[PDB]
């Protein structure tokens, strides 16, 4: 198990954009085109990203190489981050993927706003941070993946994905 | 393909204790654990960083943990180096992956100091970097393995590995 491994399983691959969780034109591992309610700005967006007039369908090379620059870019968010820097700094390589999943699925921002949860990973108070990271929006719109996600900042194993 | 399933190809995987193509004990998916000659050495490495008696044998789940710290280890390798970053950051996702094999294989330091190349890469003389990198002691010592990552440096994709 790893970071990539990992997202596949929450995010799933589909190569046909559909809408998200949320509602939100999405394709591939979790690559989120746009918040707009326009299929036309999503299809707009997909072909700005992939390079080419894809019609709202792409190959699993295609999708692959998105995903590999949304996890890019979740570490680079992370690290740019004066909130979430110090906390991954802090974690193990178990943990620290943990923390990517989230901004992968929240956001820099998002994430760097948690400050009570942050404080308890940093403190190394993983049965509380957990406890604590349930009382969000995130763990209630979304529990499976959420608890999969505490659970490996509970235990620092992939425990919840083997 | 990413960069984990690029080195899982590229290292293998063995549980026991073993020489790696410099005859240096390794373990795992291309984790070095020592250049000294002793095997007891190696095994007290490998008890120190699993945190546990292993008498030179690990488990897959180990194995894939101590792969993890290795990738991120190389990531911060290069982020922290005045010469590698600029490189890096100039970058594709795909050629990334290229660069950060060759830290995982040869080190920071390693990498660093291939001036010529790293100038080529920067300036995105795709074809004169293949053929600059070609000529090393790393391309004739690992000539396959250097021809993959070669071709990815050449191509941004992933066609070596496919
Ligand atoms: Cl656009
Ligand atoms: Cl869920
Ligand atoms: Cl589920
Ligand atoms: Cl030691
Ligand atoms: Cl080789
Ligand atoms: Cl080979």
Same mark, same amino acid.
């Given at each position: 198990?790893?970071?990539? #491994?990992?997202?596949?399983?929450?995010?799933?691959?589909?190569?046909?954009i559909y809408k998200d969780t949320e509602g939100y034109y999405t394709? @591939?591992?979790?690559?989120?085109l746009?918040?707009?309610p326009?299929l036309?700005?999503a $299809?707009? #967006?997909?072909?700005?990203?992939? @390079?080419?007039?894809?019609?709202?369908?792409?190959?699993?090379?295609?999708? #692959?190489?998105?995903?590999?620059?949304?996890?890019?870019?979740?570490?680079?968010?992370?690290?740019?981050?004066? $909130?979430?820097?110090?906390?991954?700094?802090?974690?193990?390589? =178990?943990?620290?993927?943990?923390?990517?999943?989230?901004?992968?699925?929240?956001?820099?921002?998002? =994430?760097?706003?948690?400050?009570?949860?942050?404080?308890?990973?940093?403190?190394?108070?993983?049965? #509380?941070?957990?406890?604590?990271?349930? $009382?969000?929006?995130?763990?209630?719109?979304?529990?499976?993946?959420?608890?999969?996600?505490?659970?490996?900042?509970?235990?620092?194993?992939?425990?919840?994905? $083997?």
């Amino acid at each position: 198990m790893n970071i990539f #491994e990992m997202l596949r399983i929450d995010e799933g691959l589909r190569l046909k954009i559909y809408k998200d969780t949320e509602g939100y034109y999405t394709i @591939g591992i979790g690559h989120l085109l746009t918040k707009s309610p326009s299929l036309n700005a999503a $299809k707009s #967006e997909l072909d700005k990203a992939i @390079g080419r007039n894809t019609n709202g369908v792409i190959t699993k090379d295609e999708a #692959e190489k998105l995903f590999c620059q949304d996890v890019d870019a979740a570490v680079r968010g992370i690290l740019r981050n004066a $909130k979430l820097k110090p906390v991954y700094d802090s974690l193990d390589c =178990v943990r620290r993927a943990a923390l990517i999943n989230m901004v992968f699925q929240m956001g820099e921002t998002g =994430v760097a706003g948690f400050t009570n949860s942050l404080r308890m990973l940093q403190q190394k108070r993983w049965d #509380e941070a957990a406890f604590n990271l349930a $009382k969000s929006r995130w763990y209630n719109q979304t529990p499976n993946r959420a608890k999969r996600v505490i659970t490996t900042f509970r235990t620092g194993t992939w425990d919840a994905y $083997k």
